[model samples]
Target: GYINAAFRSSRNNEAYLFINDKYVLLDYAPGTSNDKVLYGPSFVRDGYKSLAKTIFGTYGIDCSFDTEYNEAFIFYENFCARIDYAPHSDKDKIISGPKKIADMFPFFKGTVFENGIDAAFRSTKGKEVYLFKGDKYARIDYLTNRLVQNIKSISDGFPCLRGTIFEAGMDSAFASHKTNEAYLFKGEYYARINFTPGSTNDIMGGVKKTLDYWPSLRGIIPLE
Candidate 1:
């Protein structure tokens, strides 16, 4: 059986969140945004397991792992910038249909919420762009408009400061350098690239070269 057609039917044939290499079943919720769907708490739980598997495998470590729904939500809150969906929209509408789950804890507020989820996506970019944002850690088939089953982290490290000059350069290019603020938190440094949308791919190569200019960060950037 394909599940509930009214809610689960993919208007655009797209799956929203695929976990452990499985397409998450989504259905529309009544009285909600057309773009919003209800999801069960179980999905977040499964996502946590998938993340544990991926992280442990990447690090070559064996450890029992457990995560709660709130924990997963917090993780997404802390580490990710998200796209917000309203109760109505056309096309690409995928959600779990609104049913309250045990893990539905609101742990974010104010500027962090605004900064993390608000500006993450724009109407011009479309919802498809969000599929790639966390896909490195969570498998999402945005191209095919399907959700992949497994979730994993492609990179991990605590943010560290390489140097003031390097940080300044990053700020100048990305954050307007208004406060000359740059930070290395949780093993990652935030960088902004000012290239046109098409040329943005070049930023990675340029960043690598820039890193070489500083010997300190040589030990930081992890290899694939």
Candidate 2:
């Protein structure tokens, strides 16, 4: 291969050598600061189907921005700022879940994302924010330290992933604010889907798993 461009980084996540105007985002664990470390350069091994996957399943990888400024646009690196959202253009092409929270929503300008964005949805937002900076998702008004199933545990209808990590970050994913639909992108392809609504039970045998695996102290836990 011929080298067209190359790069260097003050950090592991940013280092690169472009052999053909392309480079890979090598595995990185931001140590103490990132709260999140990226484990990659992962490839097919044993029963694994693909040449890559994220470890600890890449927890809480998404956050949201007002879709009023967020849209399903072409993720062309830093190529869009010059054409639209130019501090001049009216384009609403922005990514979600930055290392900073204010970076996602202007209303919460002083907020923080703690962990990077793991996933985000474009569901209707008016009050009681459903922000998901989760272990895959989290909320503004709620916090949990409980062991829970991932999104698929809630919606079996979502498609399987090409890789565990969203390699391109927010550029690789987005949602439809107008519908309960979402999109997940991998390599050069993408899929269209809708997650199961709240009414659908994603647990075992519907109600049995719910009642059995659910809180046994349901009626007498605490009065708090």
Candidate 3:
């Protein structure tokens, strides 16, 4: 199991790595912003939770991969949310993960969108849902979780979009927290596609903002 997990702090501008059971305090190392290269969150020689359990506790039955707002979600057959090894009270608001995503999103009760939980993630604020089934996808409004079903695809089932080429088929689909577009991964290649196309901005959102590298992208990131 991987022993380290990190979060890029928009508050301090540096990234923090919580390792093992040791606490990386918020005020230590290349602490806070203005430290360009970035370093540590100090070390809480004594921390609250084990970094390993926090990372693996949510190792839900035969499931992995998830998204985050303040907390991380591990979606298998149910909606499960895991608490951080060390949680910051205000920023990490706890919400009950319903057995079904639809439980929390009642509007989707009998909709076609209800069954796409095979891969589900949302924007940082949980304002939008990007549910995927291989080459096909559905976008939902964050607040209402309304299904948006207008985008079309080929008879062959590959995703058709303005910026993405799904001829190779998308291995896994995800959205960026920074922009309005979604990302599809296939091997080492990635495509940034627009789910909402009102401006030229959606196409340009990945230029300088999104990272081309994700440690999670190594090998095949599973989505089933």
Candidate 4:
């Protein structure tokens, strides 16, 4: 199975991978195989009980990202929301929306992203966030809540994706704890990006198969 969304837990070394209505939680660290699948190929509703009451339970997630506010933003169709992932806290549930994406981020009101987004990821090196929709992408300064640059094609920013399938779009992406590092997924393949500052541009490693890069999901995700 292929995942449509992926994000690391802000509180731990865990990552959640989602494929439609089901998800898998893994104890993961970049560049290492010391990976462990902590939870499922189980129904999303069962694994994240708190989410069951939200729109996410109804349509499932399109993409996600953890904000500097310590809340996770999940998108489904044209709607999105912020939810807390805090442990044992009464506030660890839907915190802000279920609102229309355009209503929440007006800059996207007339763009391809107005109706919905494909994926997003938080940057560990800066107060930044990247949003992707179709073949275009945008970078925003979360602290200032402003766009760093106008909407541009994916190849404009992530040149590493040039001439590749991912240049247009991918299923999902996430920033890792590793300095200036991140992962992008599409189907059974994934690519790595090194975002170290002051380089010619962000560097992207070769696209590799998920079955080869993630040993943790080997037995968990059945062969296609």
Candidate 5:
């Protein structure tokens, strides 16, 4: 199964991954090789209480991010939802929408990404938030409710990813809490980028097979 959305809990050490109608939880300790799948590949409707009746749990998710408030903003095709919950211990409860993405995030109004995004993540280094779609990416100052940069081609905007498959687009992304680097994924490969929002000097070396980095996902994700 390929991941459609993924996010690391802001309040804990676990990571959540969405693949079609199912979700997986992992004990992700980035800097070490101790990562392991804790639970899942379970139906999302059965795993997340608040998401049970929402389209996202039934259909799938596009992107997701954990907020400082301990809630997660989940995105579907053209809608978004906010839910409060923790991985296995506490079931999710709705905090806000299954509303239009534009209505839920007015800051995106008039932008190409207003309706939906391919991937998104909150940076651990600054007050930067990124949203991606197709071959373009946008930056947001979430604290100020501002879209700092509109749409820019990932090929040029993210120089670190130049000459790489990720230069075109990514399937999903999440900031690693332990490494403070952004883990960008596409198909069977994933890249670790030391990204700093608008900075041009951000460094990313290369890509690694998804299972090479997260051995626990060997049977879940394609090996090649």
Candidate 6:
């Protein structure tokens, strides 16, 4: 289902489109920052909602309408780490009686700070565990594994942080990835170790082991 699409490029700038079963690569335009290339999925309301639901169910988190931005931010953050989609408009669209979003944003494009995923995860690196809540992202310093600095929210427009926690049911895969299971405790990021119906404690152990070797994992980037 990979489509080819094409765009113009000069020298330092280029555009790419993957749509309708075709691949179109454009040369870079002069005076362009290599990070400015278009990438990620176009924002579609329904597709966004579906993605939200999947994340919610997968991690067992609950949210309100006002907290939806936090959900989107999480999805965007994960996409950044995984290079799963391209960036696009922040609006919803209908296709074949169903809602869909276009994935076209270039991977690793844009300023490192402006790069949603990189910013989110980079902030968490080397730290023990952190929790995100409505409009705020907080972390626990490892010296004592006690709560330390707590940022109000993602400096960007999205509600990337909000006080929340993963439901007891969704901790396995998250832990398997070596990511901490955090909860918004009294307006702070609190580390947690719990699992859902289908999750296992061993998963958390595995994740911890993997994280112990994270530096080695970083060497595997640009995975083709």
Alpha-carbon lDDT, every model: 0.22, 0.26, 0.37, 0.75, 0.77, 0.25
Across 1-224, the per-residue lDDT of candidate 5 in tens digits comes to 58788877764567888887777888777667888888886777888867778787688787987666567788988898878756566555888877887888787778767777888888764566787888899887655767787578887778888888888788898877865577888888888887755578657786988877787887777422
lDDT of 1 by residue, 86-189 (tens): 22232221122111111221322222221222111111122221111121222222334332333222231102213322322211111111122111111123
Number of the predicted model whose TM-score against the real structure is largest: 5
lDDT by residue for model 2 (1-224), tens: 21111112224323211212122222222222232212222221211221013221122111222223212111111111100111112332223322233332323343223323333443333211222322233233211222132223212222232233332232223433324444443222334445444334222111122112222212211212
Tens digits of per-residue lDDT for model 4 on 91-184?
A: 4577777789877776768888888889888876577788888899888775565777788888877777888879878888887877777788
The TM-score between candidate 6 and the true structure equals: 0.19
Model with the higher TM-score, candidate 1 or 6: 1
Ranking by lDDT: 5, 4, 3, 2, 6, 1
Residue 127, candidate 3: alpha-carbon lDDT: 49
Report the C-alpha lDDT of model 3 over 1-224, residue by residue, as the tens digit.
Answer: 11133332333222333333221323212222322223222332223223223322233221212334334433334343343422443234224443465665455566543543434434444445555444444555645546544432321222244344444233344444344544554444555555443222333233221123443222212212
Candidate 2: clashing residue pairs, number: 14
**TM-score of every model versus the real structure:** 0.20, 0.30, 0.45, 0.89, 0.91, 0.19
Candidate 6 residue lDDT tens string, 7-63: 122222333322221223333222232323233222222323433434322332121
Candidate 3 has a TM-score of 0.45
Off by over 4 Å in 4: 87-91, 197-202, 219-224
Worst 10 residues of 6 by lDDT: 63-72
